[PDB]
Amino acid sequence: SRYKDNRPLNILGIDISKMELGRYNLFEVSIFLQGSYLNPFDPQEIDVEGIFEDQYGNQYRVPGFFYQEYKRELKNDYEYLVPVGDPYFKIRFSPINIGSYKFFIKVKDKTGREVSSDKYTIYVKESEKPGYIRVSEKNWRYFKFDNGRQFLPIGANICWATSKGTYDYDVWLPKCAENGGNYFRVWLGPSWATFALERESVKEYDLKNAWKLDYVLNLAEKLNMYIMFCFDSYNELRYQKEGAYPYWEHTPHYEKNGGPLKEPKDFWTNNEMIKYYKNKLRYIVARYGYSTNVFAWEFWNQVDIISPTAFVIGEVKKWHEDMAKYLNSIDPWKHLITTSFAFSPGKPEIDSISGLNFVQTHIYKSNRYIDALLSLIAYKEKYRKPHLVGEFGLDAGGNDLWVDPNGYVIHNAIWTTILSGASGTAMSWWWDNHIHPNNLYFHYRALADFVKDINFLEEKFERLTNYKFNVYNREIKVIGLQGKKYILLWLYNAKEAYQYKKDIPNMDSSKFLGSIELLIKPPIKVIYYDTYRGEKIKELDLDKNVIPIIEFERDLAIKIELL
């Protein structure tokens, strides 16, 4: 209760960031008040809200949140945050419609007293922002922005920083963005994470870490990147004796550390814990929900490998149903909601919950992972909602770093997932010790430039099924999409795609290798695409359905336009 107050409830002053702003831009109200509360993070102690109304009858009820200003600096090798001023309350809003808005502030504290501001008027003009990310109504396999443009996530996990904190994201995000990346994922737990809200407590949230998440969200805004916020990770509910980076003994949920839980199993049903968790969701919506750069709320990293003493499928399912419904109801902008599992096939009892808007796969597999990805993507089409391969690698033990310095494993996965019908790229691990130091971003740039002008929302892509392969000197395989106007092929050498010792192909690719015959009607334009340099190798106009395959070392992309 470091932030208690026991004065009669009064608004003391408000600051408004701007009277005029663009569609989907941040409108921020700062509020100085006094009142009676033991915990500014608990709406039963103090409840700040902004009530906004556009000219079209839509009303938004935005919970407010407690805020401390900081000034960051880098002390040789660690970030250090210096508090500036007293903490206070904020409301963060983002307008969907343009035109005029009226809003007022309402506050209630534990005494039952209620105060409110007069109504203020703001004006919203048109802007360049595409809006929030939703499931496409045209093709449930894909995401869209509110303005109808596709959102095809290309990026990686970038879930926490080193001790340099936000200064690491100052380096990683611009590199990702300039190489076609528009997506990453961050962790808000366990308590050691860069953005951990529950750092010392499950009842009060860490204002420094929340400030760091502000900063990284703002950087994503400037770079047109979109973030999945992962609220909790399995480590929090896993006992030391169970291994796999366990954290229960250190987590603030545990009664030993001041929390309400005697054991991780009680997380799903303990009424005190459920109440604090809803307060946390309210804090997250209040502080970050305005942002169109929040791609999705993700409840859990790999909830299936919490302690087996704590996984009760019926209670975990009901908890996801109830929390998705609650989160949805208090989120004025209705961001996408998801959850994840370490078991690659997932848990159908939870994945089929309608409050979870898309499903995920995590897979770390060293052999024939191309076939595993294709198989999992075909399988999860049963849910009729988008599928994100949210984590991918060779080995949960990190073998990738030593055996694949050139990123061939990432390469194979991102081409396989895009051209098998997943909503976006497979999302690699190892951002800090693999992708960045080895400068593997060029793999994403080549993929992004290949799909850049393809509208997956209108192509009605189906997986390629009835081709004839005519290759003699090699075991070539193909993964393809067939659509209205395009056929997209990724061909790979089964003997070379899983060998990681050779240097990146520098292909002087003239010779004829073989052919693939497809059920299409000429004429067609065939584009051969170097997947490593990210450029057209050759372009060919054809009058027959026999498409030559030129020589390639490891793999080759082909884009075929139906004319």
Ligand X SMILES: OC[C@H]1O[C@@H](O[C@H]2[C@H](O)[C@H](O)[C@H](O[C@H]3[C@H](O)[C@H](O)[C@H](O[C@H]4[C@H](O)[C@H](O)[C@H](O)O[C@@H]4CO)O[C@@H]3CO)O[C@@H]2CO)[C@@H](O)[C@@H](O)[C@@H]1O
Contacts to ligand X by CB under 6 A? 192, 233, 235, 244-245, 301-302, 342, 362, 364, 391, 396, 429
Q: Report the nearest approach of ligand BMA to the CB of residue 230 (Å).
A: 21
Helix intervals (H) in 331-365: 348-351
Q: Report the nearest approach of ligand X to the CB of residue 299 (Å).
A: 14
* Interaction partner, residue 391 (ligand X, ligand BMA, none; CB < 5-8 Å by kind): ligand X
Judged by beta carbon, residue 345 or residue 437, the one nearer ligand BMA is: 437
Q: Report the nearest approach of ligand BMA to the CB of residue 74 (Å).
A: 10
* Interaction partner, residue 380 (ligand BMA, ligand X, none; CB < 5-8 Å by kind): none
- Which part of the chain contacts ligand BMA (CB under 6 A), choosing from 163-171, 254-262, 409-417, 538-546? 163-171
- Which part of the chain contacts ligand BMA (CB under 6 A), choosing from 164-172, 184-192, 197-205, 486-494? 164-172
Q: Report the nearest approach of ligand BMA to the CB of residue 437 (Å).
A: 7
Judged by beta carbon, residue 82 or residue 244, the one nearer ligand X is: 244
Q: Report the nearest approach of ligand X to the CB of residue 68 (Å).
A: 24
Q: Is 164 in the site for ligand BMA (CB under 6 A)?
A: yes
* Interaction partner, residue 274 (ligand BMA, ligand X, none; CB < 5-8 Å by kind): none
DSSP, res 434: I
d(CA 105, CA 116): 5
Judged by beta carbon, residue 165 or residue 246, the one nearer ligand BMA is: 165
End-to-end CA distance of the chain: 69
| Residues recorded for the chain | 563
* Interaction partner, residue 164 (ligand X, ligand BMA, none; CB < 5-8 Å by kind): ligand BMA
**Nearest alpha carbon to residue 532 among 563, 557, 551:** 557
* Interaction partner, residue 238 (ligand X, ligand BMA, none; CB < 5-8 Å by kind): none
Q: Is 97 in the site for ligand BMA (CB under 6 A)?
A: no
Q: Report the nearest approach of ligand BMA to the CB of residue 371 (Å).
A: 34
C-alpha 310: how far from its chain's center? Answer: 26
d(CA 473, CA 201): 63
d(CA 79, CA 59): 40
Q: Is 72 in the site for ligand BMA (CB under 6 A)?
A: no
Q: Report the nearest approach of ligand BMA to the CB of residue 7 (Å).
A: 45
Q: Is 175 in the site for ligand BMA (CB under 6 A)?
A: no
Judged by beta carbon, residue 160 or residue 490, the one nearer ligand BMA is: 160
C-alpha 202: how far from its chain's center? Answer: 23
**Nearest alpha carbon to residue 233 among 90, 27, 81, 390:** 390
d(CA 256, CA 267): 15
d(CA 243, CA 306): 11
Q: Which residue is nearest to ligand X (CB)?
A: 396
In the block, tokens 């391969």 appear at 389
Judged by beta carbon, residue 224 or residue 439, the one nearer ligand BMA is: 439
* Interaction partner, residue 168 (ligand X, ligand BMA, none; CB < 5-8 Å by kind): ligand BMA
Collapsing DSSP to helix, strand or coil, 562 comes out as: strand
Collapsing DSSP to helix, strand or coil, 548 comes out as: strand
State which of residues 97, 162, 224, 515 lies at the interface with ligand BMA (CB under 6 A).
162
* Interaction partner, residue 96 (ligand X, ligand BMA, none; CB < 5-8 Å by kind): none
Write the CB contacts of 483 (distance below 8 Å, at least 6 apart in sequence).
Answer: 459, 460, 461, 462
Task: Please check whether residue 114 is in contact with residue 106, taking contact to mean a CB–CB distance below 8 angstroms.
Answer: yes
What six digits make up the tokens of 73?
């600096």
What distances in angstroms separate CA 142 from CA 201, 384, 390, one per listed residue?
38, 10, 14
Judged by beta carbon, residue 57 or residue 243, the one nearer ligand X is: 243
What distances in angstroms separate CA 340 from CA 100, 467, 477, 492, 539, one per listed residue?
40, 35, 30, 30, 42
Judged by beta carbon, residue 402 or residue 469, the one nearer ligand X is: 402
Residue 89: its H or E element = strand 78-93
The answer to whether the Cα torsion of 26, 27, 29, 30 is positive or negative is: positive
Residues numbered 408 to 467 that lie near ligand BMA (CB under 6 A) are 436
What six digits make up the tokens of 94?
């983002």
Q: Is 519 in the site for ligand BMA (CB under 6 A)?
A: no
Q: Is 16 in the site for ligand BMA (CB under 6 A)?
A: no
What six digits make up the tokens of 165?
């904190």
Per-residue binding letters, 371-390, with ligand BMA (x by CB under 6 A) = --------------------
d(CA 150, CA 458): 10
Judged by beta carbon, residue 37 or residue 300, the one nearer ligand X is: 300
Residues numbered 541 to 560 that lie near ligand BMA (CB under 6 A) are none
* Interaction partner, residue 434 (ligand BMA, ligand X, none; CB < 5-8 Å by kind): none
Write the CB contacts of 86 (distance below 8 Å, at least 6 apart in sequence).
Answer: none
Interface residues with ligand BMA (CB under 6 A) are 162, 164, 168, 171, 436
